[PDB]
Design a protein around this ligand. Sequence first.
Ligand SMILES: [Zn+2]
Ligand SMILES: [Zn+2]
Length: 72
Amino acid sequence: RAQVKETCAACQKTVYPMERLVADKLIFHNSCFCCKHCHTKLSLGSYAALHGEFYCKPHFQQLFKSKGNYDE
Ligand SMILES: [Zn+2]
Ligand SMILES: [Zn+2]
């Protein structure tokens, strides 16, 4: 049962309490969510997330043409 056993969506590993963060309602390690095109550790601070994939703002703009915003 998931109570104190959260499973991560950015690396699918069970997240431990200190690392258990919730970005965009997805529960994961604060340390793991990187861009799906480049393993850029964009975790918590400046990131662009999409259903399924976490993307860096530059790649998100080019590849998905969704958000990004890097003085753009
Ligand atoms: Zn993770
Ligand atoms: Zn990227």
